[PDB]
Amino acid sequence: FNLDTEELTAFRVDSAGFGDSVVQYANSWVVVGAPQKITAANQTGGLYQCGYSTGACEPIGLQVPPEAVNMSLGLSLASTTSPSQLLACGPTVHHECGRNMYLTGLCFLLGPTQLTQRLPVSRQECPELEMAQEGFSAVFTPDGPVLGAVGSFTWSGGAFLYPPNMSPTFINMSQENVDMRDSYLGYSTELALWKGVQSLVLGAPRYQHTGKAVIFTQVSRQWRMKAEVTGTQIGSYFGASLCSVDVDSDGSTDLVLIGAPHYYEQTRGGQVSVCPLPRGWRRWWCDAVLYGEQGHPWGRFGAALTVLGDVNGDKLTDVVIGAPGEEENRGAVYLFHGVLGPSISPSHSQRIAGSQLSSRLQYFGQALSGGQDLTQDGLVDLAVGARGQVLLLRTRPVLWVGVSMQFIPAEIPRSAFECREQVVSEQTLVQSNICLYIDKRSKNLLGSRDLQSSVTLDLALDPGRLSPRATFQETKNRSLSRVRVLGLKAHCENFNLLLPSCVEDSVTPITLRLNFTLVGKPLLAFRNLRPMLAADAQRYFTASLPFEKNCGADHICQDNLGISFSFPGLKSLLVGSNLELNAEVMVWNDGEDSYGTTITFSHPAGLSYRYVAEGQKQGQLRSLHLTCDSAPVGSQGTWSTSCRINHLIFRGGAQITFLATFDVSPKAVLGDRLLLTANVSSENNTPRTSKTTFQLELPVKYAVYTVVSSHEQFTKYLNFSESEEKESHVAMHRYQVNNLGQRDLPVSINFWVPVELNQEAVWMDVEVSHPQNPSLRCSSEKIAPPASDFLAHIQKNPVLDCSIAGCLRFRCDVPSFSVQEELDFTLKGNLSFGWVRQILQKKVSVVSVAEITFDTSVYSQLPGQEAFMRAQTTTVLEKY
């Protein structure tokens, strides 16, 4: 919501297909594309570098080989930051092989280094890969660039990876993949970096003529497919645009966008699809719910898009999306924000379209790339290409401010209360002190701008009523305004208020609210231009001033209120389950009537209050309209949510009970215990000494998903050749385990392998290998079962669980079972045939049980109860 629509730069270089594709070069420059900038004999186009300093585009020098013809370069672009490089492309090279020519594609890598040319410039001689137009869409990655082919084989598609001067690789979908004929796999390409290895993605607009998107991984000596998702509709063109974006800033790509400009059901606005990046192949959904659009048919929404990053400073990256088909063919662009993890906000905050005194440009927003600070005014910039010209929109600084309000005279002493009519109005003098300070600053950093700003303040008392209960002295009106200078350091000024000796209503405290904004906006240089406020701008902040209620001609007015609350049925409370937290608070009034009685809680950051609004029905119970305001308090961690029983009285020794519910975040940062309190008092504040706070402390645990399966590489080997009692046909029980939780947590995987059986060993020298992982330490202990009559026991069931034969427990501890880690391992041992006769039957089967464990306290499994943490493997020894 902070995209400049006034003081921006505009490059209108008329060079045919100019401003048809653009990218953020090294921060200092922006590169535009003009594929159709005719040069020589039906040959290339040309590129243009443009600087902010001077509003002009300088041509860029290029050694266009005679070989590359009608390649119309610039059509595809891509820039990296790692070291700053750029990639321009002619995806339409024409090489005459006599009977018929084809299309190969030719790219150029530039930068502050050597002007490389990489297909690489082995002019693709004639004869699969004739019309693949490689470089149609490119994107970098720590291990070399990556260009995309379309006409690979049956126009299946793919992408040619280039390493560091090492010979390049390539990824299609094999041939065993019968489908994927004519889908342009690689029409669009994007990276998907992660704490682990990188991940590529290709767009296939026409998989079965609808559109699918496929994601690839490059495991050591594998380079297989991670997952994929078909399109939603035929022709929708699901696969057009793709953008891996970072909801937060942890650096690990969280989710991925998709384009489908030509989609609909009733309105053909367009379609962009949000699709997080779940880990664990063979499962992946572009349906983490939503998908942004607009109410305007034939709009081509999703034509292009780029990560913009943190613009409004709320730690939640924001993205941009083009739609050159909006309005009457006019252009358009949209701005959305992240939320928490995999998600975005359907309701956009801004919609800068071509109606923004764009004198006359038809379709704009065709392409766009942003995230780089190029004008060198601090915050990021955006570049959006349009037919003929390309614009730059800067991000205006969003600071927001916190405020405090207080009335020096806490309440009113009843002095100028009921008053009298011999002699004067001695108009009592109340003081009201307000302060203003700005705190969330991380992006704009110290120094000019982040500090100085002017502001308009507009205080007004008892606004909603046509009976001003007072007036400021400075102006004498029931309200006043003054422009004053803010800073990151508070600014406190107290004002003079005049209460008329005589007044009707005293029960209802007098309100004082402020309307504040950002006036002027001149700050030193014009390197800030316009700052602004955020979305959640509670610019209307109000503070109340109570009165000393007449509790009689005497009796002194004793404020006596107690309080006590509990949690009905609350069992254990782990973070994940038990999201909403039901609190049943009771409260007393063993003293004078409390009128505007307020009830405030203290809690860890990991929760806040949400209105219950229940009706339907219950109980002997809450009936109660109450106003609650959350706010940060303590030095670091805790904070208070106050809740004043808005509109009615709490009289006599009457008690009352209401219900207040606190939502808790699944990632609730809080100690192994969480306490909370309840300050209770009357509207007349707390005139005296010992507070009546009520607190309690609870043990806290945390959700975890821990599962374990029995890998199908398991030895069920029975066969008739049983002449003698040999030893070594070692069996192999492989167990794989992994946690889909969301927290790294130590664990200890236990096992149970039969051996001794009445002195007669079952299988000997059994140990456990731990491949693909460090040499971990495992424990070993023998144990003897209940010793029941095993004769008849296994006669029931040929099984040989550990309850019959002396088993062997393996306690393989684990330092930190990081989430997503599929840490797996197997166990083997030469299996003796001797004990087989001991029981006098055939087709027996020995079983091993494997159960994973973890500290029952602090952690625990979520869904109720999943025994997925206890696999099993049953081998057979049928030998006749």
Partner 1 sequence: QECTKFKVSSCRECIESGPGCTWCQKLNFTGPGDPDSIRCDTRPQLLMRGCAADDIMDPTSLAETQEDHNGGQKQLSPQKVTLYLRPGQAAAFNVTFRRAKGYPIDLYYLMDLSYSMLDDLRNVKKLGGDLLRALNEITESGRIGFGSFVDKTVLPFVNTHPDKLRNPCPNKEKECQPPFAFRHVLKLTNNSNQFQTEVGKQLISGNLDAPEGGLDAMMQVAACPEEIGWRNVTRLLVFATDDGFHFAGDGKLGAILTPNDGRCHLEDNLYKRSNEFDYPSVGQLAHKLAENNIQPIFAVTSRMVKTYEKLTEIIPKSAVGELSEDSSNVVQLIKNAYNKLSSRVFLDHNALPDTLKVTYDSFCSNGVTHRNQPRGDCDGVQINVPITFQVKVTATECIQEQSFVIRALGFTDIVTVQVLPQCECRCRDQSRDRSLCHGKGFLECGICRCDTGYIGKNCECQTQGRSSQELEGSCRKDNNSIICSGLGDCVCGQCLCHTSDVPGKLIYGQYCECDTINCERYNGQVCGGPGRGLCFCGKCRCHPGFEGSACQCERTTEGCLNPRRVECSGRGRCRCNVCECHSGYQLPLCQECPGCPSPCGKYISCAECLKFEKGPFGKNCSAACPGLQLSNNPVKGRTCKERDSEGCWVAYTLEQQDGMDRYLIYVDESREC
Ligand X SMILES: *[C@@H]1O[C@H](CO)[C@@H](O[C@@H]2O[C@H](CO)[C@@H](O[C@@H]3O[C@H](CO)[C@@H](O)[C@H](O)[C@@H]3O)[C@H](O)[C@H]2NC(C)=O)[C@H](O)[C@H]1NC(C)=O
Ligand Y SMILES: *[C@@H]1O[C@H](CO)[C@@H](O[C@@H]2O[C@H](CO)[C@@H](O)[C@H](O)[C@H]2NC(C)=O)[C@H](O)[C@H]1NC(C)=O
Ligand Z SMILES: *[C@@H]1O[C@H](CO)[C@@H](O)[C@H](O)[C@H]1NC(C)=O
Report whether 629 belongs to an annotated binding site.
no
Q: Residue 30 or residue 180: which is nearer to Ca ion going by CB?
A: 30
Q: Residue 679, interface with ligand X (CB under 6 A)?
A: yes
Q: What span, in angstroms and rounded, lies between the C-alpha atoms of 491 and 859?
A: 46
The residue (of 41 and 840) whose beta carbon lies closer to ligand Y is 41
Q: Binding site annotation covers 254? A: yes
Residue found by looking up tokens 């003098």 in the block:
429
The token pair at 47 is 């590129």
CA distance 632 to 644: 17
What is the C-alpha to C-alpha distance for residues 211 and 207, in angstroms, rounded to an integer?
5
Find which of Ca ion, partner 1, ligand X, none residue 101 binds, CB within 5 to 8 Å per kind.
partner 1
- Position 693 contacts ligand X (CB under 6 A): yes
Q: What's phi and psi for 783, nearest 5 deg?
A: -150, 145
Residue 475 touching ligand Z (CB under 6 A) = yes
Beta bridge partners of 708: 737
Stretch that binds partner 1, among 263-271, 424-432, 555-563, 848-856 (CB under 8 A): 263-271
What residue 578 binds from partner 1, ligand X, ligand Y, none (CB within 5 to 8 A, per partner kind)?
Answer: none
312 labelled binding-site residue:
yes
Q: Which one among 477, 538, 623, 713 touches ligand Z, defined by CB under 6 A?
A: 477
179 is in an annotated binding site: no
Q: Are 2 and 395 in contact (CB under 8 A)?
A: yes
Contact status: 264 vs partner 1 (CB under 8 A)? yes
Q: Is 843 in the site for partner 1 (CB under 8 A)?
A: no
- Backbone φ and ψ for 77, nearest 5 degrees, come out as -135, 165
- 612 sits near partner 1 (criterion: CB under 8 A): yes
Residue 796's H or E segment, with its range, is helix 790-796
Side-chain half-sphere exposure of 192, counting CA atoms within 13 A: 23
Question: 362 is written with which tokens?
Answer: 């038809």
> Does 615 participate in binding partner 1 (rule CB under 8 A)?
yes
Q: Which is nearer to partner 1, 298 or 417 (CB)?
A: 298
Q: Between residue 506 and residue 535, which ones bind ligand X under the rule CB under 6 A?
A: 515, 517
Question: Is 381 a known ligand-binding residue?
Answer: yes
Closest approach of Cβ 38 to ligand Y, in Å? 7
* H-run or E-run covering 431: strand 428-438
**Is residue 723 involved in binding ligand X (CB under 6 A)?**
no
Kindly state the smallest distance separating residue 81's Cβ from ligand Y, in Å.
39
> Are residues 190 and 224 in contact, defined by beta-carbon separation less than 8 angstroms?
no
User: To 5 degrees, how large is the angle CA 341–CA 347–CA 350?
Assistant: 110
Integer Cα distance of 650 and 587 in angstroms: 10
Smallest gap from residue 735 Cβ to partner 1 (A): 11
The structure tokens listed for 327 are: 């309005």
Under 8 Å between Cβ of 201 and 225: no
Contact 254, 276 (CB under 8 A): yes
User: If 0-12 CB within 10 Å is exposed, 13-18 middle and 19+ buried, where does residue 383 land?
Assistant: buried
- 46-54, 93-101, 167-175, 784-792 -> range binding ligand X (CB under 6 A): 167-175
590 carries a ligand binding annotation: no
Nearer to partner 1 (CB atom), residue 315 or residue 673: 315
Measured CA to CA, the distance from residue 68 to residue 66 in angstroms comes to: 6
| Residue among 228 and 377 whose Cβ is closer to Ca ion | 377
Among 170-178, 565-573, 704-712, 858-866, the segment contacting ligand X (CB under 6 A): 170-178
CB 514 within 8 A of CB 459: yes
Contact between 266 and partner 1 per CB under 8 A:
yes
Give the residue, chosen from 92, 218, 317, 860, that forms a contact with partner 1 under the rule CB under 8 A.
92
Least distance between partner 1 and beta carbon 93 (Å):
11
Q: Dihedrals φ, ψ of 359, to 5°?
A: -45, -60
Q: How is residue 437 written in tokens?
A: 């300070």
**Is residue 696 at the binding interface for ligand X, with CB under 6 A as the rule?**
no
793, 804 contact by CB (below 8 A): yes
Q: Which one of 110-118, 472-480, 634-642, 831-839 is the stretch in contact with ligand Z (CB under 6 A)?
A: 472-480
CA distance 504 to 494: 26
Q: Which residues bind ligand Y (CB under 6 A)?
A: 41-42
Q: How far is the CB of 101 from ligand Y (least distance, A)?
A: 12
Kindly state the helix (H) or strand (E) to which residue 795 belongs, with its residue range. helix 790-796
Residues 268-307 that bind partner 1 (CB under 8 A): 268, 280, 282-283, 285, 287, 289, 295, 297-298, 300
Q: What stretch of H or E contains 780?
A: strand 778-783
Check: CB of residue 530 under 8 Å from CB of residue 647.
no
DSSP class of residue 340? S
Residue 310 interface partner, choices ligand Z, Ca ion, ligand Y, none, CB cut-off 5-8 Å depending on type: Ca ion
Taking the least distance from each CB to ligand X, the nearer of 84 and 640 is: 640
Give the whole-angstrom CA distance, residue 184 versus residue 207.
8
In 162-236, the DSSP E strands lie at: 169-171, 189-190, 199-204, 212-217, 225-229
Number of residues that bind partner 1 (CB under 8 A): 95
Burial 207-222 (b: 16+ CB within 10 A, else e): beebbbbbbbbbeeee
Selection from Ca ion, partner 1, ligand Z, none that 646 binds (CB < 5 to 8 A by kind) is partner 1
Contact flags string 627-666 toward partner 1, x per CB under 8 A: x------------------xxxx-x---------------
475 binds, among Ca ion, ligand X, ligand Z, none (CB under 5 to 8 A by kind): ligand Z
Strand partners, 86: 79, 110
Stretch that binds partner 1, among 92-100, 348-356, 428-436, 560-568 (CB under 8 A): 92-100
Helix, strand or coil, per DSSP, at residue 164: coil
Q: Cα-flanking dihedrals φ and ψ of residue 133, to 5°?
A: 40, 45
Interface with ligand X (CB under 6 A), residue from 40, 633, 648, 696: 633
Binding mask 460-479 for partner 1 (x = CB under 8 A): ---xxxxx------------
> For ligand X, which residue of 172, 452, 511, 742 counts as binding (CB under 6 A)?
172
Cα–Cα distance, 2 to 71 (Å, whole number):
39
Select from ligand Z, partner 1, Ca ion, none the partner in contact with residue 25, using the beta carbon and a kind-dependent cut-off of 5 to 8 Å: none
Q: Closer to ligand Z at the Cβ: 98 or 464?
A: 464
**Residue 310 annotated as lining a ligand binding site:** yes
Distance CA 411, CA 404 (A): 17
- Closest CB to partner 1 among residues 123, 209: 209
Q: Residue 240 Cβ, how far from ligand Y at the closest point, in Å?
A: 29
Q: Which is nearer to Ca ion, 256 or 545 (CB)?
A: 256
Question: Cα–Cα distances in Å, from 871 out to 112, 749, 847?
Answer: 58, 11, 11
List the binding residues for Ca(2+): 246, 248, 250, 254, 310, 312, 314, 318, 373, 377, 381
**Which residue ranges make up the site for ligand X (CB under 6 A)?**
153, 156, 172, 174-175, 456, 458, 515, 517, 602, 633, 640, 677, 679, 691, 693
What does the binding site for ligand Z look like in residue numbers (CB under 6 A)?
475, 477-478
